[PDB]
Design a protein around this ligand. Sequence first.
Ligand SMILES: CCCCCCCCCCCCCCCCCC(=O)OC[C@H](COP(=O)(O)O)OC(=O)CCCCCCCCCCCCCCCCC
Ligand SMILES: CCCCCCCCCCCCCCCCCC(=O)OC[C@H](COP(=O)(O)O)OC(=O)CCCCCCCCCCCCCCCCC
Ligand SMILES: *[C@@H]1O[C@H](CO)[C@@H](O[C@@H]2O[C@H](CO)[C@@H](O)[C@H](O)[C@H]2NC(C)=O)[C@H](O)[C@H]1NC(C)=O
Ligand SMILES: *[C@@H]1O[C@H](CO)[C@@H](O[C@@H]2O[C@H](CO)[C@@H](O)[C@H](O)[C@H]2NC(C)=O)[C@H](O)[C@H]1NC(C)=O
Ligand SMILES: *[C@@H]1O[C@H](CO)[C@@H](O[C@@H]2O[C@H](CO)[C@@H](O)[C@H](O)[C@H]2NC(C)=O)[C@H](O)[C@H]1NC(C)=O
Ligand SMILES: *[C@@H]1O[C@H](CO)[C@@H](O[C@@H]2O[C@H](CO)[C@@H](O)[C@H](O)[C@H]2NC(C)=O)[C@H](O)[C@H]1NC(C)=O
Ligand SMILES: CC(C)C[C@H](N)C(=O)O
Lengths: 458, 469
Amino acid sequence: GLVSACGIIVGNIIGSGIFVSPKGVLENAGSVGLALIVWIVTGFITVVGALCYAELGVTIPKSGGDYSYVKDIFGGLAGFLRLWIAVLVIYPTNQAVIALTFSNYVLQPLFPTCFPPESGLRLLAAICLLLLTWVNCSSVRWATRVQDIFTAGKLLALALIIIMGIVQICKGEYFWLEPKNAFENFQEPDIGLVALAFLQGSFAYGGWNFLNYVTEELVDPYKNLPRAIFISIPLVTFVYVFANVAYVTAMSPQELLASNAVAVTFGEKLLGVMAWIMPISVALSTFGGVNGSLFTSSRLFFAGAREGHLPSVLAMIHVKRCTPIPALLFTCISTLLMLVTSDMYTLINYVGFINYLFYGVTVAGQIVLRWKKPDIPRPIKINLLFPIIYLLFWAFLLVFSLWSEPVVCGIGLAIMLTGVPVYFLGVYWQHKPKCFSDFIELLTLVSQKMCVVVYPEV
Amino acid sequence: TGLSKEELLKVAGSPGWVRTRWALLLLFWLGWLGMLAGAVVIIVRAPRCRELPAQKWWHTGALYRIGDLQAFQGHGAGNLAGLKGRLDYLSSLKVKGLVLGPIHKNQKDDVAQTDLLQIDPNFGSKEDFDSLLQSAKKKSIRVILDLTPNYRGENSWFSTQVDTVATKVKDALEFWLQAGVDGFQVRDIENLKDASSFLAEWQNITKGFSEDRLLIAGTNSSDLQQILSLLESNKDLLLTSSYLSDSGSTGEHTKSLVTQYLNATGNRWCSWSLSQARLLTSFLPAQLLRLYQLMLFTLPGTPVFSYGDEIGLDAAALPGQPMEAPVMLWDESSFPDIPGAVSANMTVKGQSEDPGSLLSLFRRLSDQRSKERSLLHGDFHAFSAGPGLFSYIRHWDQNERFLVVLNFGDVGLSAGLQASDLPASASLPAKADLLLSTQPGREEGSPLELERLKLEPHEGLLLRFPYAA
Ligand SMILES: CCCCCCCCCCCCCCCCCC(=O)OC[C@H](COP(=O)(O)O)OC(=O)CCCCCCCCCCCCCCCCC
Ligand SMILES: CCCCCCCCCCCCCCCCCC(=O)OC[C@H](COP(=O)(O)O)OC(=O)CCCCCCCCCCCCCCCCC
Ligand SMILES: *[C@@H]1O[C@H](CO)[C@@H](O[C@@H]2O[C@H](CO)[C@@H](O)[C@H](O)[C@H]2NC(C)=O)[C@H](O)[C@H]1NC(C)=O
Ligand SMILES: *[C@@H]1O[C@H](CO)[C@@H](O[C@@H]2O[C@H](CO)[C@@H](O)[C@H](O)[C@H]2NC(C)=O)[C@H](O)[C@H]1NC(C)=O
Ligand SMILES: *[C@@H]1O[C@H](CO)[C@@H](O[C@@H]2O[C@H](CO)[C@@H](O)[C@H](O)[C@H]2NC(C)=O)[C@H](O)[C@H]1NC(C)=O
Ligand SMILES: *[C@@H]1O[C@H](CO)[C@@H](O[C@@H]2O[C@H](CO)[C@@H](O)[C@H](O)[C@H]2NC(C)=O)[C@H](O)[C@H]1NC(C)=O
Ligand SMILES: CC(C)C[C@H](N)C(=O)O
């Protein structure tokens, strides 16, 4: 029971983050040895943050994850803003970054030293996104059986980086890593640029918040769920460290920052056959990152529509194949908007700041559920000094990210404050405007006939 | 809410909606192939990457000649063993070559007692020579040993005979290459008969051993035709001459002196130097001394410096010094002959913390010569400017360009750069980011316009601008 549940958490955290972040976690920390401190502290903060979610999952047993926890504490307005950001900012931009990774990795063997066309990178990332939406709008059994072929792509690519890293350790190729003297670089970067490298290391650790409340099938929890956090997450940290020391044995740190795809500059070295096998296996890895992000994006349209928010033309399923078409067409249009624009490293920053702003609301909400309302049955109880270490690291990271990038972090707070007036015309309205309430009846019936979608039975 | 009914929908849906539901799936699928065919057209219409040339180790960085070992370290530790401790300072300079002086027990104009295979006992032996070659390889620093046979007599190359001493060097080429040296140098080859014929025979044995071995030859002739007579048969030969050792008090004298060498040699890989065994404070005053370090690090070729050129060591400043080998000013205890004679800004220790010193400008130019791709093997294109000054552009395929403006005059001359006969691949924009300057008084990182660029006397500045469409 425990050993099969640990592999569920490992396979859901490890994704396409180890192929993109390395370059942003280094260009920010300066040193090589300081960048490996970021990969261990981020793996420790994610353990602490996931034990505060495992206590809220058995205190208030809910479906929806972190969206339902902010509706039991700070119930009306703060729960809607968790939903508002997660369908406009979180899920559209997590999908646009993995799609831009796919076009960067298949266009590195062509143009190996110069720049590929920037209009052909966007066009190739819109082809990957529009194809997997068609795979998801039809036939829910197809996208489940094709995501096992994408899983073997990520495992074949990661097994080649690790065992080729220990070959060069069994050589004299440990010049930058093992010697502990190449630890000097640009120091005029602030503490505020060290806080930007924690945003980009945490992109590779994403998928821990909406994860461990589904592992219900797990046997006797209340003892097997907190034990699975202590095993599966520090093994992801061991893989992310061992794959980062293997990157600097194959190239210099000035050579890594010049590359657009690090795993294939790794493959242009160290053999002559892996100039072919590295862009194949990583592009297969990014197909499963986008396909896996289109399953779970529709689960939050389900939970929002049965609560009063998020109108009922969403969370509808087709009559023959139980697939939500208007919830998949909504998360695909907003991904195409966050594509033909922004950069790619700026986007990571953009999503990493607004993730941590709501990682701290539910963890502080776990503290006020001990002051307000004690004497409720808690089977899992963590020490009270455990979410304070998270909230101290939370406050030192949001105040130093606004100081570093004010225009990337300030436009993310503008979308959240846009959710405040639309909540009051949306939920807190008296239902007298029949001249506009029948426009919802007109749009729902047309969308219910242009596809053959219908509301579910619950 | 607005829910109809699973059973109510299928009797009101699709009377003629079944035809407009197929007209959107076909229009989706035709727009997905017109998107896929539109991305193959853009990709194959992209130009290409330009192929990177096969760079050797002396193409990437600068060389550092150490003529006298006793004067580079002080007499208290003057040996080959004491040189091993100074490899950390030379790694801070980011130099790649270690052209260290001849150590092969010359006996003052005696051909019969000059063995180029045996080290003089005042430097060490083969036991600590091999220790220097191994510890320098760890820091990626190559050792070049020079084999001028009569290096302590009045005339080199043993003027009483010609080919006994020529076969003396030929046995020493194959012996020191077995021990693992990475190059050779011969100086004063104007005192040779059949000089252009012996350099081709010696470069055979050097390149026949390996392609990563170098041979340097030095003259003192400052005229163009005597240099080209030595380089008409040899091509992979670094030739350090006194060609740039004139005054250059006007800017177009040095501009015409550089662009005539590259035009006559066909833009091959050359060496840039003021002399063959002499420092920069000769031939130059102290106010043109930072202007020449910016030029030698931004010209196409390999820059070769003597020891004491990064701190501006003047041999005529302290009295009682031989001008061929002055002492290196490491600390204030480095010249204990006359007490209190050297200052703190005249020293390695004091200039290492000063951010406006000559050693700080040397380290700030040596790191960008060694990592920027359009300075490693970029093209060169000089253009015209005002009355006297030198301006040129280094550019590679799609990397970031560089622009150097050097004022050799004495008044506050405006630049007046025109971009007329520059190639359209790397023409200059309206604004360029400043990278450094030789004199303080400019804010570094500022986009400043190139239309109105007024320049100070003895001022040289380095700009950079990206590849634009
Ligand atoms: C250059 C193009 C830029 C990209 C813009 C694309 C914008 C469209 C949003 C992306 C969504 C694409 C996924 C479509 C998936 C097909 C639905 C499906 O799964 O079929 C099973 C399903 C089969 O059901 P049955 O045949 O009734 O049994 O199809 C349907 O029932 C729904 C059919 C209509 C729904 C829309 C079909 C696609 C519309 C896109 C048309 C594109 C041009 C429209 C103008 C917009 C401007 C570009
Ligand atoms: C034809 C095929 C299409 C397939 C289907 C696609 C349909 C996607 C529809 C997109 C829906 C997303 C917008 C819904 C907004 C949520 C609001 C809500 O809670 O509604 C519940 C509310 C209650 O629904 P009930 O469950 O039916 O009671 O329903 C609505 O009121 C929907 C309309 C919201 C009216 C407020 C204004 C709309 C906001 C959009 C403007 C965005 C920028 C705002 C500018 C700021 C300055 C003001
Ligand atoms: C060495 O250089 C010579 C000429 O530059 C090359 O040709 C040799 O010339 C000598 C006499 O000058 C002959 O004895 C040899 O037989 C020639 N070699 C041949 C014909 O292969 C010679 O190729 C050069 N050697 C190397 C290793 O590059
Ligand atoms: C290079 O150094 C020599 C050494 O003094 C200069 O003088 C030449 O010396 C040799 C023999 O010592 C004579 O055969 C030449 O005739 C001398 N040259 C002249 C012009 O008189 C020589 O001038 C130096 N070269 C330059 C260009 O300064
Ligand atoms: C120096 O480069 C220029 C072109 O960059 C060439 O000079 C030409 O030389 C011929 C030979 O007398 C003249 O007829 C032309 O008028 C010159 N053109 C220019 C633009 O100067 C040549 O490649 C090089 N010079 C020489 C003498 O070879
Ligand atoms: C080190 O700094 C001193 C000043 O502290 C320099 O001495 C000055 O030199 C200039 C021209 O050489 C004179 O006009 C000044 O009068 C000198 N001032 C003093 C106080 O001596 C000295 O030149 C500097 N050394 C180097 C190598 O630049
Ligand atoms: C989606 C991202 C926030 C993190 C994801 N789990 C990855 O490894 O790439």
